[model samples]
Target: KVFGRCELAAAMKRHGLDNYRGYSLGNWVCAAKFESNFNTQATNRNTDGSTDYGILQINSRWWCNDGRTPGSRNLCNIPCSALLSSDITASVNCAKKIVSDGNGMNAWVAWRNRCKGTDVQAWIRGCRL
Candidate 1:
């Protein structure tokens, strides 16, 4: 159930992080691992019958709109459902853009801060992506 590895790497590259070898990538991976165990097809049914999907557990139906279909856009006009589709690289790239927004590690750092005390490897091992 892998998703968004290459896309994430590309985002890191665009942000001027020479490599995903440090705590950055690892931290994200760790968080994702802990959150969804890397299951891209993962979905959770809420008490109200609403759902969440993908490796990062994004709610495609609500966040993107039936990502199983093509061309359904989510927040910022990027397809949220596509985040769970076969093109996982695109999903990774999308997540990267969400995190970076052209200003660099602000999002990643925030993610690190949130998950640092939990499992450092999952967040830092993003290098493996």
Candidate 2:
């Protein structure tokens, strides 16, 4: 699913991402924008041989088990393929795990480079919260 900005915002909010770990709804949206442009099927291969999957670009090395990434902990205990589903439930759930583990919202480099220290809420300005 390629989500409209507001549509993704609404879905993330519905899944309890709003103010999650002190990050606003827009913060998550902004990360998704940079990571995958809100496309659920997005994937990337990291130089470390790890794969990033889904809109949040959850990494296979630490979050999901793709059976391809070396030394995967499968911390989220989900198949990496689950993140590609249009439903987004698995992606959102795994993202929460990523942030809760002492990393906060710094788990994704894209978030740091693009969303952090910026007016992230502007991403959702016209959207009804």
Candidate 3:
């Protein structure tokens, strides 16, 4: 059966999201919703920022830059594109890695807690929102 916008929104909400309109999940969901409406079979070129494919919006170049098969059967051998196609969990993990490794979301969170919600971006970057 096909799922509607509300259903998808509900799914995201259940995952601890408060505002589902402009957050990271919302951005991801908007892409997924428009491309395939969360359809697992979704595949297309992104209009902006990156060329992502599949349900998790994996970049094609990240997968094939090394001349390897995208989304190969093995996770170790899998490219970013393949990893995204394989499962949403993988994509989330990748995002988590990016946030954690690059910007230090924990520090951002500490700042947000200290500031008491005064700065949204600081909190978002901290909470990895």
Candidate 4:
């Protein structure tokens, strides 16, 4: 599923992303935009043999289990494929865990390069929520 910006914004808000770890919903929305363009099935392979999965791009090395990333912690205890579901609950929950682990939004480099310390309101601008 590919979400419109506001659609993704509302979904993130519905899943308790607003003000999560001092980062606004806009930050999450912006991160999703850069990471996966709000596509639920997105995936990217990393140079270290770890792969990023889903809309938020949760990584196999530390978060989800892909059965391929050696030394994976599987901290989220979820199959990486689960993150690709259109439901997004797994993605949201895993993302919360990532932030709570002290990584914050820096877990995603796209957020640092494109969304961090910027006026991210544009990412969620048209959302009625």
lDDT of 3 by residue, 51-95 (tens): 444444345544322244344232233444554353344444443
lDDT of 4 by residue, 1-129 (tens): 999899999999999888889788899999999999998999999899999998998889989889998887899889999999999999999998998887678879999898888889888877799
Whole-model alpha-carbon lDDT for candidate 4 = 0.91
Cα-based TM-score, every candidate: 0.52, 0.96, 0.39, 0.96
Q: Rate the local accuracy (lDDT) of all candidates.
A: 0.50, 0.91, 0.41, 0.91
Cα RMSD of all models vs. native, in order, equals: 6.6, 0.9, 10.1, 0.9
Give one digit per residue, the lDDT tens place, for model 2 in 1-102: 899899999999999898889898999999999999999999999899999999999888888889888787788788999999999888999888899999
How does candidate 1 fare on TM-score?
Answer: 0.52
Instruction: Name the better of 1 and 4 by lDDT.
Output: 4
lDDT at 102 for candidate 4? 77
Q: Which digits, one per residue and each the tens of the lDDT, describe model 1 over residues 56-105?
A: 55544334565463333465355555656644554455555455555343
Candidate 1 lDDT score at position 29? 54
